[PDB]
Each structure stands twice: as C-alpha cells, then as structure tokens.
Write an enzyme that holds these catalytic residues in place. Sequence first.
Site, PDB file in Angstrom:
ATOM      1  N   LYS A 125      44.700  80.281  58.669  1.00 13.18           N
ATOM      2  CA  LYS A 125      45.141  79.522  59.925  1.00 13.18           C
ATOM      3  C   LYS A 125      44.400  80.027  61.317  1.00 13.18           C
ATOM      4  CE  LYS A 125      49.122  77.467  60.178  1.00 13.18           C
ATOM      5  NZ  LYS A 125      50.716  77.208  60.379  1.00 13.18           N
ATOM      6  N   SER A 139      49.944  76.402  66.876  1.00 12.02           N
ATOM      7  CA  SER A 139      51.468  75.814  66.111  1.00 12.02           C
ATOM      8  C   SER A 139      51.348  74.304  66.680  1.00 12.02           C
ATOM      9  CB  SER A 139      52.779  76.501  66.817  1.00 12.02           C
ATOM     10  OG  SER A 139      52.552  77.987  66.417  1.00 12.02           O
ATOM     11  N   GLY A 157      56.048  72.751  64.671  1.00 16.68           N
ATOM     12  CA  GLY A 157      55.310  73.794  63.792  1.00 16.68           C
ATOM     13  C   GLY A 157      55.783  75.122  63.693  1.00 16.68           C
ATOM     14  N   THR A 158      55.015  76.008  62.911  1.00 13.45           N
ATOM     15  CA  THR A 158      55.472  77.294  62.299  1.00 13.45           C
ATOM     16  C   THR A 158      54.911  78.140  63.613  1.00 13.45           C
ATOM     17  OG1 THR A 158      53.222  77.590  61.509  1.00 13.45           O
ATOM     18  CG2 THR A 158      54.553  76.733  59.673  1.00 13.45           C
ATOM     19  N   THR A 159      55.640  79.325  63.399  1.00  9.02           N
ATOM     20  CA  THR A 159      55.909  80.367  64.502  1.00  9.02           C
ATOM     21  C   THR A 159      54.564  81.101  64.512  1.00  9.02           C
ATOM     22  OG1 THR A 159      58.214  80.706  64.297  1.00  9.02           O
ATOM     23  CG2 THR A 159      56.895  82.257  65.779  1.00  9.02           C
TER      24      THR A 159
END
Lengths: 243, 241, 204, 195, 221, 195, 231, 244, 250
Positions: free
Chosen positions: A61, A74, A29-31
């Site tokens: 988000k 994440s 996933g993204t940071t």
Amino acid sequence: TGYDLSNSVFSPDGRNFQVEYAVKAVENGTTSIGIKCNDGVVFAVEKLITSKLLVPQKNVKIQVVDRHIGCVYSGLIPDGRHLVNRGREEAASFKKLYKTPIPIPAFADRLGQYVQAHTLYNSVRPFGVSTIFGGVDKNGAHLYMLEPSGSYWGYKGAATGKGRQSAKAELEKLVDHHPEGLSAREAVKQAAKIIYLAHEDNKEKDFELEISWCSLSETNGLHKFVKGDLLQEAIDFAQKEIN
Amino acid sequence: GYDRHITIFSPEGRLYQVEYAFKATNQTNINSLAVRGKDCTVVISQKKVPDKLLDPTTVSYIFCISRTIGMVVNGPIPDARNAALRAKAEAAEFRYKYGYDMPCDVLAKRMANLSQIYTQRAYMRPLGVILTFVSVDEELGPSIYKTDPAGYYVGYKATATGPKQQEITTNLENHFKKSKIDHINEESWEKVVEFAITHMIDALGTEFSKNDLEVGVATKDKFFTLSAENIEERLVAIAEQ
Amino acid sequence: SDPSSINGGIVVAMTGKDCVAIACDLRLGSQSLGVSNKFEKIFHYGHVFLGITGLATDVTTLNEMFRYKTNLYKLKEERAIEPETFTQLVSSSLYERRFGPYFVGPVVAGINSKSGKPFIAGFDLIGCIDEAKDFIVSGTASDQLFGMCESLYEPNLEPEDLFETISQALLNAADRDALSGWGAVVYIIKKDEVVKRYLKMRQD
Amino acid sequence: MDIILGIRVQDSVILASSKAVTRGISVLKDSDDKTRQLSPHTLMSFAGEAGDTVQFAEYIQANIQLYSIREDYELSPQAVSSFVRQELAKSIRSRRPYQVNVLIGGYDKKKNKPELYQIDYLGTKVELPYGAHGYSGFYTFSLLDHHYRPDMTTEEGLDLLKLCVQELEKRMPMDFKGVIVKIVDKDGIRQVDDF
Amino acid sequence: TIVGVKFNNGVVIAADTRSTQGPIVADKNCAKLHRISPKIWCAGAGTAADTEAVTQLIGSNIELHSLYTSREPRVVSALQMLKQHLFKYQGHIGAYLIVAGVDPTGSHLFSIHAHGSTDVGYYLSLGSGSLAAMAVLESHWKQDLTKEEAIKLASDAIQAGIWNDLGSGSNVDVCVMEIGKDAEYLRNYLTPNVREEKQKSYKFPRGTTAVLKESIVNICD
Amino acid sequence: SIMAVTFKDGVILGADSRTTTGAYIANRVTDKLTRVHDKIWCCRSGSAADTQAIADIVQYHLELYTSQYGTPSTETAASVFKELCYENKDNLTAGIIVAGYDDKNKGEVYTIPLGGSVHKLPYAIAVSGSTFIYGYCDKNFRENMSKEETVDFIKHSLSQAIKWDGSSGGVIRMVVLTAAGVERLIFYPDEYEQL
Amino acid sequence: NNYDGDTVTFSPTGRLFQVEYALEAIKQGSVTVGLRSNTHAVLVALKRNADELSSYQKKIIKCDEHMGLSLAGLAPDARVLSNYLRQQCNYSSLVFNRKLAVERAGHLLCDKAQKNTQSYGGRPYGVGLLIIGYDKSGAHLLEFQPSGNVTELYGTAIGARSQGAKTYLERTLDTFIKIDGNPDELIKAGVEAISQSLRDESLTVDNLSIAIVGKDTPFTIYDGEAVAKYI
Amino acid sequence: GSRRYDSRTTIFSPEGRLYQVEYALESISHAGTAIGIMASDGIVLAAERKVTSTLLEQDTSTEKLYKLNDKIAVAVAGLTADAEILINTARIHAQNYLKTYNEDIPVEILVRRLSDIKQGYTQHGGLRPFGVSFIYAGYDDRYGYQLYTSNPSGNYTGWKAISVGANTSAAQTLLQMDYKDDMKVDDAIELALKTLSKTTDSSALTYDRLEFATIRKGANDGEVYQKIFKPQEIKDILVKTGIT
Amino acid sequence: MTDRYSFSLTTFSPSGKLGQIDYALTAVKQGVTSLGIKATNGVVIATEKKSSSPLAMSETLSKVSLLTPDIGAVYSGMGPDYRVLVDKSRKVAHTSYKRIYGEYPPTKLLVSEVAKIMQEATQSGGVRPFGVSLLIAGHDEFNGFSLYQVDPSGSYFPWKATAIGKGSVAAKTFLEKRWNDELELEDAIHIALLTLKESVEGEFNGDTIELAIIGDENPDLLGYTGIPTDKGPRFRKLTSQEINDRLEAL
Ligand SMILES: [Cl-]
Ligand SMILES: [Cl-]
Ligand SMILES: [Cl-]
Ligand SMILES: [Mg+2]
Ligand SMILES: [Mg+2]
C-alpha cells in the site's frame, strides 16, 4: 438548499459540502501514520486481512515517489494511486528542468495545487484520500499530511483513517516525552506500536503491519521498506506493549 | 433555486456564490493588519497552531510573491496557495515581458481581473480568499492594495481583514484622525512593526507571545518575514514602554 | 519568373493648385505577347482614386478587396473614406501578407472633402507609405517616370496645365519601356468634378 | 492540351479547341473535347497541366449547375467568369496550384450580347473580341487584328477561324489533329459537325 | 544614417530622410523618427515597412500597457517587447532600431538589431552610414555633453552619413527627449540639400497632348 | 574570449568587450557577463541575439524558482541553460559558461558548449568562435588560489587571447562572486597590453 | 438517492453510488473461480446461455502467452479492459523485450478504472476480472473490481453465489497451494470449488470453461469435449 | 455536473413546437411596430420608436431602420443588440457575393442566408435563438421591388404589405383593407403612417417617435435611391398627409 | 475537467423576458448615480465616489476612465465588470480600428464594439450578462460631440443628457428642465454638479465627486511638440481643486 449536490458550490456558510463528504470516505479507510525523526521520516499502515486467501506481504500500500519520497494514504485506494502517479510526473518534470531531486515542500505544493484543482469545477469529484508523505532533502527531514480540500501542513507526527484519534493521542505523547528528538530505529518500533494500538478501533478482522522509512544515516537518504529481522523486531516490540 | 449554486444573477441582482465566498474568508478565524511607514510597509497576521503534532514553521498565511511584493491571505490555505502560485507566475511573466518588476497595484489589478472572471464564468468557482498585497513601489512608495472574491480592489493608507476586522479598522481610523497624516511618521521599520502590534493588541484586547504572531516587512528592493526571535525582540521593546 | 514584370504597366500621380491628377497605361501582356489594350489600372472608391501596377491577378484581387472594405467602411461610418485614411488601410492590408505579399505597386490620389487639400501617396508590395507633395510613380517604367516627373513637374499647376505635364510624363516614359503603352488614361480630379481623358499614343 | 481559340462576333461566340492528347512520344487520342458546358448559354474551353484541366473544368461545372438549381436562374457570363477567376486566384497561393488556362464564351440573355472572357492560371481575367492561350496567340492575334470586325456574322466568324487554323497547321511544330468548333448564341450551344 | 547621443539631462536621436530602392531614390524626405510613446522615440533602418510596422505594434501595446498600469511607459518595456518580437521572426523582419527616451527611471539609449540583439551606449549609430556617423561620434564624443553640444554632435554624425554614404542624403531629423520636459521633435532640423532653380520651365502649350476621348467621371452617390 | 575560475573565497568570471559584424566592431564596450541570479552569472559567446534570448529566459526561470523553492543551486542554473541549448540546438548558436556561489558548495563553474552538453570544471576558457580549450596552462591554475592570484591569472589569459584573436578586444571585464557579495572589475588596454 | 445521478457526486456518508451500482452488475454475472499453486494458476468459469437454442457466453479471454482473465458482469467492458491489457503486455514485449509482470497488469487496470470514477460524462466499468499469470516471480492470481481495487490472492471467486466457492477455497487453502507440477489435480480442485456455487443446474460438457498457465504451460483455454475429463 | 443547469434551448414540446422560438416571438410582440408596404414604383419602411424620452437625441439615432447595401434595407423588431450582430453578418455576406460575382446580391439570397443562421440556433449549439424579426425591403434586376420577413424560427416569406412587432393582428387587417396592387409610393407612404397612427399605444403619433425610409427609382434613369428620412423630413410628410 | 458549460445561461421565459438581462438591470439600479450632459462645445460625465472604507484611498479607484484621447466612460452597477470592460474597450479601439485605419475610432463605432462584447455575454455559453450600464462621452471630426448609454443587453442609445443608477428617475427629470441646445460647457458642468448634489447624501466636495469633460484639445497634456496636426487629447479629468472652485459659485 441542494448546495451539497454539486462540487465547487459554496453553501451559505461558505463551505464545500462535497469536500466534507470526501473526508467521510477517508475516515472510513484503514489507519495510516507518519513519524518525523532526527534525520528522516517513518511511514506505517494497517492492512485488513479480509480472508486467509490474501497472499501475505504481496499487497503493498506504501508507494515511493522519485527515490527519496514515501507516500501512504487512507480512503479510496485507487484515488491515492492516481495522486501518486501525478506526484511521479511532477517529480520527473522538476528533476528534468532543475536537475536536483524535488524538495519535499516543493513536492507538497505540487500535490496540494492538484488536489485543490479538483474542488474548482462541478465536472470533477474531490479526492477520497488523506495522504501522509515526506522524505529527506538538502534542508533535512520533512513530513506532510494532505486532505481532500488541498489543505496540507508540515507535521512532527501525522495520522488519518478509522483509528486517527487513537494514533494522534499516542503521537502527542511521543512529541512531549522526546523534545530533543527521536531516532530512526526508535521511530520504526514506535510506528509498529501505534498501528497495533490503533487496530483496537478496527478489531473485527485481524491485520498485517507494513512500515517504510527515509533516514540520512540508516537508508542513506533513500526510501526503503522495513523487511525481515527489523520488521519482526518491531512487531515483537508492539506485541509486548499491548500485553 | 439554481441561481444560488452558480455565478448568475438572482432576481434582486445579486451573486450569492460571491457572497458565500466572502464568508469562507473568515473560516480560518485569523485577523490581518497592514500599515505604511515613511520608507516601509508592515503587515502582521495572527498565527494559531492548535495541533501539537504540527510543525509550526510550515504554518503561514504570508507569502513572498516577487522580491519586492508581499501577500497576506485571509481564507483557507488551499485557495491561498492557489492565489500565491498564480501571483508568483504573473509577477515573473511581467518582469520577462516588460523588463521591470511588476508593481504591487498592477499585480493587485491582475489578480482582481482573474477573480472577476470567476464571478462571470459559471464553470469556475470564486476563490474564498482576500489577498492583501504590500510593497515599497519605486514610483508610488509604500503601497497596500487588497483583492476580494467579487474582483474589487483599492489602495489603502492602512487596512485590516478577518472576523474582528471592524474593531481594528476603527482603531486605525481614530489614529489617522489624530495624527492628521496618511502614514506612520517613523524612520525605522522596527518601530512601524511595534506600532502595528501595539494597535492590534489595543483593538483585539489580547496579549501576544512570539509564536502567536506572524510579521511581513516591505522595504525598498526587498520584502521579508520576521522569525520568532525577530518578533520576540520586537515584543520586548513594546513591554519596556 | 519576376511577378512584378510579367504583365507590365505604369501609374503616375501629381498634385496641382486645388487639384490632383492620376494616369496609367492600358497594356496587359504575357511577357513579350500583348494580350489586352483595355486593362485600366485606376479604380475609385467614392472620391478616393487607387492606381495599381504589378501582377495583374493581384491588381484585380486588390481592387475587389478595397471595394469590399470601403463599402463596409461607408455603411458603418455613414460617410465616404478620405485619402489619408484609405492610405493607412492599403498599408495595413498589404503588411498583413508580409511573408506572402501581393506583387503590386499601389498609388492613392484624391482631395480631402473637409480640408480641400490635394493628397497623393505610393506604396511598396508590403505596404510602406511614400507620402509626397510633388508626384508618385509605379510600374515597369518607374525609372523613366522619375526622370520625366523630376524635370517636367513644377508646383501649383492649374488643372488644364497639370493635364499636359502628367500626360507628357506618362507618354514619354511608356515609349522607353517594352512592357508599357498600348493606350493611356488621365484622371483630372478637382474638389467636386473629375474629367477622364484617353490619350492618343503609338501602339507598339 | 495546347490550342484553344475564341472569337466574339455580332450575335455569337465561337470556341475552337485542338483534338490531340499527347503523352510522351505518342498521340493517345485525336478526338478529345477540351470544353465543358457550364450553363445552357455559357461554354468554357481549357488547356494546361494533365489531370488539373478536366478536374478544374468539372469542379466549376458542378458549382454553376448547383447555383442554377438553387436559384432556378442562369448566372450571367460576367458572373460565371468572375467566379472562375476567383477560384484560380485562390489556386495560385495554394500548396499545389491548378495549372489551367480557360476561355469562357457566353450569350447574356439580359443584354442580348455575346461575351468572351480569357482567364490564365494566375486568375488574370480580360474581356476580348478574340482570345487564345499559350503559343496559339503568337500566330492568330496578328491575323485577327487584320481581318476581325465587330459587326461580323457567324459564317464570317467561322471563315476567319479557318484562316487561323490554316496558319497554325502551316507554322506550328506539333500536329494538334484539327479543332472541335462550338457556337454560343441566343439559342444556346451547338457543335459544328464538319471542320 | 541614424544616431543616438546621451547628454546630462536626456538623450537625442537623429536620422537622414532618404529612401532607396536599388540605386534609385524612392523618397527624398521620408520620416525615420518614430513615436513609440510621447517620451520614447525610435530611429529605424533596414526594410521601411518593417521599421514602421514593428514601431506601431509595440507603440500600440505600450499605450494599452500604460493605461492598464496607470504609469508613463518605460524604454526597457519598448526594448524588451521589440527584441522578443524580432527574435521570434529570426531576422526575417528587417528592423534595425535606435530606441531612446526619458521615463521615471531616467534617460535611456539602446540599439536593436533585426535578429533581436540589444546594446547599451552613450552614443550609437545604425544603417549604411553608421561607419561615417561612428567616425564623427568616436572623434568628438565626450562625457557630460550639454543639450546644445549633443544636438550638434548628433546632426554632425548624420551629415557625415548624408555626404559620404550613397544610402543616405537630403535633410536631418532630430528628436530631443529631456528629463522633466516635453520631447521636442525637430522635423527637417537641417535642409542643406535644396534643389537649385531649373534653367528652363517645361510647362507645355495647352493642346500639346493628343486626346482620343473625354468623359465626366461620376464620384457622387 | 571568456573564462570562469573557482578560487578560495568563490569564483571569478572574465570576458572581453568586443562585438563584431564581419571585421566591423559593432560594440567595443560590450558587457558579456550577465546576471541570471544575485550570485549566479554567465559568460556569453556566439550569437549576441541567441545568448541574450537564452539568458533572459533562464533569468525568468530562476526568478520563478526562487519565488516557489528559494535560492537555486549553480547546478540548477546550468541545467536550465543546457535544456534550452540542447532542445533548440538546431536553431541556436550559443556557447555559455555558468559560474555561481553557494555558501554550501562555494564557487562552481559549468560550461554549455555548442553541442548543448554540460560539464562541471575547476575553471573553463572559451576563445575565438566559442572554442573551449582543454588545460590552457593547467600548471598556471591551482585549487584554492587567492582573489589577487585569480584576477592576475584571468587578466594574463584573456590578454594573450586578445593579442592573437581579432574577435576579442576592448576592455577586460570581471565579476567576483563570494560570500562578501558581487564586485565588478574593469581593466583598460594600457594596463593589460604590457603583459 | 439524490447522489447517484453521476460518478462525480459523493453521498453525505462518502459513498460513490454509480460505482456501487457497477459492482451490482458483477453479482448478477455468472460465477467464475480462480486459484493457484507455486507452479500453476487456474481459471474455472460457469458459462451462461440465453436459452437451449443459444450458445454459452465465453467468460475467459487470453491477454498474452503468460497471462489472461475470466469475466463476470458486462462482457463488452471485459473486451475493452482485456484489449487494453493485450496492448500493455504487447508494449512491454516490443519496447523492453520483457513479459509484463502480473502485479503491473493489476496496477494498470486499477488506474484505468479509477479515471472513469472521477470524470463527469463517463461511467464506471460494469465488470469484475480474475487475472492469472506466470511471470519471473512464479504463479499469480489477481481480483479486479471496477472501483479500481485490485488484490493478489491464492484463490477467490466472483459472480452470483460466489460465496460458496470462496468459503471452500478458504478451507482447502493448505491442500491446493501445494499442488506443484500436477495440472489435472489443481483443475480438479478448481472444479470442486465452483461446484459449491451451483443450484439445481450441474456442470455439463458445453457449460464448463477452464483455463491454465504455469512453468512450462502457455495460457490455454479448454472448452467442449476437452473439459469432459473433469466432470 | 453541468447537465443540471442546461435549459436545453433546442428541443421540441410534446405538441411539436420549439419552446425558445415561441417565447422569442412573444418577446418580439412587445417591440415597436414596423410596417413594410411594396408599391409598383418603390417600397416604404415605417417603424415606431419604443416610448421616446424628450432628452433622447433624435436626429443622430438609429434603432429600427438599418442599411444592408445600396439596394437593400431592413426594419428591426426585437432586441436591437441581437439585430446588429445579424445586420453586420448580412452586410458582409452581401460584399462576399459582390466580390465573387461582380454583381449586387439578389434580395432572396441575402434573406435565405440570414434566415439559415437563425435556423441553426434552433437545431444545434444549445444557445438561445436571436430575439429579432426583420422586414427586408430591397431591389434586384430579377424580381424588382421585394418585401420579405424573417423570425427567430429562421422561416421567411414574401409580402405585398406586412407588419412585425406590436399590434400586427390589427395592423395586418388595416393594410389588407386599404392596399391595392396598382398603388404608388406616395399612396403607400400615406397608408404606412395612417396604419401606425391607429395601431400605436401612444396618445398621438409625432415625428420624434418615428423612423421612415423609401426605396424609389426617383434618381435619373434606371437606378435605385435609399432615402432614410431626417426628423424634419418626417415632420413635413406627417403634416402633408394631415395627421398633425 | 474542461468548461462543459457550452450552453446559454440567458434564455427566454414564457412571457418573452430575458431573466438574466432584467436581473442585470436591477443590479445597475442598486448602483451609485452617474450622469452625462452634452453642451455645444463639449460633454461632461460625472459620478459619486462611494468609498468602501475611510482608510481606503478613493484616488486609486477610478470610476471615470479614458478609452481613447477623445472618448471617456463612466458606469453604474458592478465596478469589477466595468474595469474588465474598460480593458477590453481600450484594446478593441486598437485591434479592430487604430491598427487598420491609423486613427482612433469615432464615438459611435467604439460604443458599437463595447455593445457587441456585452451582447455576447447575453448569448454565449457558460457566462452571465455584464452587471453595468456605461455612459460613453466622445468627440470625432465628422460627428462632433456625442453621448451614448450602453445597457447589459448590448443596446445603446444617443442622449442630449441622461442619468443611470440609484436616483436616475429624479436626476433625468432635473436635466429635462435645465437642458437647452445653446448650453456652453461651463453651464453643463454647473448643471451636472447641481443634478449630482440631489443624489449624493454624505460629503459633497472634489474628493467625493469624480468628473471628466470631452472639450477643447489640450496641447499641454500631449507630452511632445513638433507635429502641428497632433493638438492633444479632448478628454480631461477635473482635479479635486478645480471641482471645489465651481462649488463656491454654486
Ligand atoms: Cl512564500
Ligand atoms: Cl487582466
Ligand atoms: Cl551582447
Ligand atoms: Mg461560477
Ligand atoms: Mg511602348
């Protein structure tokens, strides 16, 4: 073998491989990061701009629980949303009976026990998210990080996702260089910098920054998003630091 | 070999999922020790904070179950907290139904009976934790009762749990051979904590700072944990002797 | 609309020397109307005798119920149920219907096959046990039977004598109740023999 | 639904049931058969609350007919009566009890004996030489007590029934529009065409 | 008429032995003293089936609890289990109980009303004879009673009920629960209501009763 | 008659000792001041059974709350009382005064009357059949009174209620909630009557 | 391989294969396009026939007066999810006298899809949806995927060869976004976009399916002779 | 999920057999032999105890022969625990019938219901079938003396003489050879014992390894007696027939 | 979520074996030795207290359990499975008997109920059999003294004397030689201690041996007087001292 085919099965090591596999989804996933400050907490997240066709600022988000708790995660985004929905039910039932808004440690265990429950049966799948959450209660500021196993601790700073090792390193320096404590407005600027530095591990697609904060002084102990001038001030600070 | 995936018997009459749950017990690499005084029961556990970003005050494996009952866990924190919340619920429900504080040994039995069900019912996995319950019971006096994933439980004069359990066990065994008694013949709980730490140091061969240890004390009508400063004062006393 | 006095009828039980006696009237009515003069209210499960007064549908239902329960008892225990144990089973079974009770006044009589001790007991509709040395009374003429028993009865009567005393107790009580009579049956119960006598009484 | 009578003689059981159906102030029908054949040698007459009577009768009829097919055997009158009693004894502690009274007349082919059972809506069963439900027994029980004998023929039993019906037609306030009479013997169930 | 009286080293409960249906005496010597546990006894007033049933159910559950915990049962357990049961049924279970007994915590005396209210006292009384019994207790009770004094006061308070209340009569049943001793149950402790000799014997000449038929009943297999 | 009064050092809870069935005093030494937590107490009025059942459940909830989340607020205790009283208002007749001491909030007093509503007040008094009085000599009550003043104020208030109301009587019990701890006071008739 | 038997099993690399297979059903589905300005939001759908004797599968479903979607994948699953949206739009009207926000519509579809990816016995939804709507914050276009991932966009496309139309919209972004108070021109841009996903076959009168919602325009579907203007 | 660990106990083989039923019958074939013989004037039930130990209490023991009511008994072959579950069900069904009709349950009706319960475990529920075969010996006023057997399939059939458990093949050949229709109970007793004596895997057939029962009309005038033989009574009948 | 395991985990194999029952019996074989001997005037049940650690207090773990005043139970196999079976056994003695008949069940009928619970774990969905064999000694007025063995299958048999667990084969041979029908209770205790010494390897004293009897009524253990018909429990657990006294004259 075949100990990794079914959730809730102990390997001969004493490990739940299905939980360790869920962690791989989180690492993908993204940071996302959390920074605990003098009188509150700051949350920041990396939003990958897949296309020009994505509407800027309109794919939020970071989620609020009650009015005083911030949640960022994440991994599998839907799994995060499912966990926050449960968190809102837990916070509502606590407030309904006990009147006071749910203390953060109390709220932490409510998520903890729910996530841990999804490692007790083969009929269910572990959660594919690490969740960074916290806020201000009667006893002050609290930052937590929760993992697919149901494991959670309190943190001075937290990081998860593809750029976690980079973010963790930059967080460790802030703890060392500010032992007497970091201010809320400082933590917002630092949060921005750490996301920009952590974006080096995900630099194919350009990204959009998103920050939120709970501060006893700055937000009056409520969860608010950083927007307008204060957001652009934090972006400018981060842009100046990479160059 | 699906007889190793769920809690059904192997041909040699074994439950592998129970045996693997026991191995999960040592996943934290933490050693716990419990001893009984005249008036008190002391439990000490190693405290390891490897990450610098962690808030050390929130990193604990000692839980306050009731107001008289303390529980230290050897195993992963998720299963530890699962066991803690259930024990707390069970201790409260007992007091409401039967009109007196749940005894240490009765809570131990209850949590052991729950553990037993996980070893017989297939859809539930065992918890990968060993629960050490401590109190000063109003009938039995200073009490140590320990539960495991097999659903076994028993009382203890003293006990140890974790990777280097056998070293701590033999150290205590040798002391009770010499002293010729079933407890630490000491008036104050402060000196019983000093004994517990001293014999852990001698057994593990490691020194301890105030932040390397975590202490729980049971007296008549309360169980409480010591702060870093409470432990520091206790470490100074050992050093000056 | 009082279930315990629609059908009417009476039961009385008495202890003697190494014997017990239980007796009942034979009337079943619908209030004022006499319907049957052959409605026996005394049943036996092995050597344990049960008399039941009250709502006749519940008298029949409880007989069928205790036959069922004592049949299963005997198969599992491999012996006939004793009076003391049966008493407890009646009490259990009635209190199970605490808030929807059977409108009945049961009476247990029999001799313990082991100890040889004469035993009688009475119950209310929700299963309270009245254990008595002397006598037990039940039904629409209970007041009348209490008067007769308390004056006529003496301890340690021989079977032949005890027959006369219980018979006279029932007959004279029934004759002062509108919903009782139309014939009577007396069981004389010794350790290992039981005589059953039908009494001649006024049919009004 | 008012008058149902029953007489057990030497070799048969006779059931007499009133033909009138009265709703409000009007007599809707004067030819109503208040009986169902349960098995070839067992007849049940009924009286009570409107609807409940027929609904209960047909339900019992179906259950006995089902037993007959399953076992290829006719259930005894004692067995049928015991089944019917238990159904009414359940009913009385129901949400809405069946308010139905029944007479069961049967010839037991094993004992070669006629049998008459009287069961009320509470499930109060009794075996009788003669029976009735409601206000019918008020006149007929005294008459039957006088004239009845156990060794009577079917013709004697029908004459004794005529005496009961004549007494009812004289002293009863309602016109019950006469009775349908049915005889149950070793040969089965037949209806007396003229009465 | 039921009472409880606390003394130095224990508690004593007492009761009358009369059962009444309207104005009629149903039982002249029924036992109103119930054993919940070996050293926890209960005096019951109200519906006789209810006091026995509620006393046996809690007594059964207390025995299973004692086996599970490996401890002598406590009076507060019997109290808490009884009151919660009675409250659930909103008074429809008509049991008014005096609960007393020696446990490891000491000697205890409680009363329970049918709706699930409990009271603590040194002296208590329940039932139709409670006002007659309470008059004696209020007149003669003192702090630091001996066992002999407590039995006398308890039995006197029952006697007040027997004589002056029409709902009470016959004999006096006492149960003494002393700390460190076996509970002693004195059934028919006093019998001050013995029926006098009858003037005449009503034994009939044999053959007096007219008999229609005789038959031998088969009770064998 | 029951009241709770906030003062300088904490809060005092006062109540009488009389329990009545009709005109018969069932208990003349009743303890109407009940512990739900170390420094959270309540005054009970209305049904003895109802108030005991509620107090036992609230004590259970606060014991479980303490295990998980640490010492609960007086507001939290009042909320748990309200929840039980409001949701079960149809079946319950219980009027409760909740008083507690925090080191942060000091003395707080909450009243849950028959409605099942909650009210935070400097002091509260309920007399007769759980009847809450507005004011009750508000010129007699000041904020930050001394303990000795507050005891005298409650002693006088309750003694006047007992004078005029037969449901109230016996001894006056009080419970003092301060940082120092818990103190139990008792005043016998001979002291409080001559006021 | 060994980890695709059900939706309750993670792969060693942390993948849910049953979800990824559900995603594959969408790629096999016929192309549909979504785009919006500030005033209007448009759905264009290429309908698919079984043969020349068969009708063309309807791709566009109306949810309320101010909201509807186009489908690509399992049509029955679109029916289940569109019926759920209709009820949620309906609940918002009846209870709160409030038109359901397009963003909340997205959130509700996400949370319904998610539960079917964490429970044994059940299966993931096998359809992708493009939701358009006009609410209190103007025109909106959403992309739903049965993983649960919902995304707000200026424009997009899903189905077979959708990448062609998605590239065009990426280039045209600055042009079509400013088509305010001109429905026909915004549709023309949507029809020219879907045209970039055609191979051999061209847009015919009973082949093309268009839907529009906007400021003073209820959600209306154009089929048959009504779309002849845009060929 | 849990699908992985389901044995699917209620499915057909490609040949159209029920696996678990076939394997249950295999289990029963290793159990002690039980023989039922029906005569004109009564029924004999004889059963062999599974390899007895010298320190087993023989007199106060019940392994093979169980009473269902006063007119019906069963001989068991298979898992005793499984049999007891079904026996307690059958005992209740009998008392339910008596309660409803005020008549003792006809033998076939009790057999059919017990057989229908077994059937259910083969068609639904996903549980293992009962590893039990019964010989039903009973009397009613319709068909008189009756012998039936049921097996884990839930199929039941009537018999003049039958065996279940071990060595049924051998036992059935010997019964078929010596059985005739006009046979007496005393003759049937002798046949039952002689058959066990020849089929037994033991060295010699002794009293301590047997359970025996008769259903006669030996009581006074038109009433049925069930005689579950005592150890000493088996010892006597074993000497009288000249096997010891 | 929810228990999806509504199917049998114990099924017939092609050979007709019930695997999970066979494996459960294997677990019982690995278990510590326990035995029971029936005398004319009582019954004795005995077992070794295999102590997990010398720091552990072996008194707290009770291998010999009172089920009713007149019935006691000992086991071989998995201790936890025994502990929950004792709980269920004590409760079923009340719910299915005492709360109906107002008296404690006879030995054979309580055994029958324990057997039923163990049979259900053999056929019910999502459960394994119990990994224990029980010896249940009891007295009742109409059957007198009796000793029963219960197996994981649910099968139970009455015994004059027997043994289960580690050294059962050897123990049973020893009992066959020593047992007669004229044994007094003291004689049966003596034989029980002799039999158990063979199977025990380490220390053999009152602290390592657990032994109980079903014998005469014990008024002193009743806890109250005043009811002549209540004469007290027939079950008595022998003390550490009482065992050591009988080991001197061995
Ligand atoms: Cl804690
Ligand atoms: Cl438990
Ligand atoms: Cl009170
Ligand atoms: Mg399992
Ligand atoms: Mg009369």
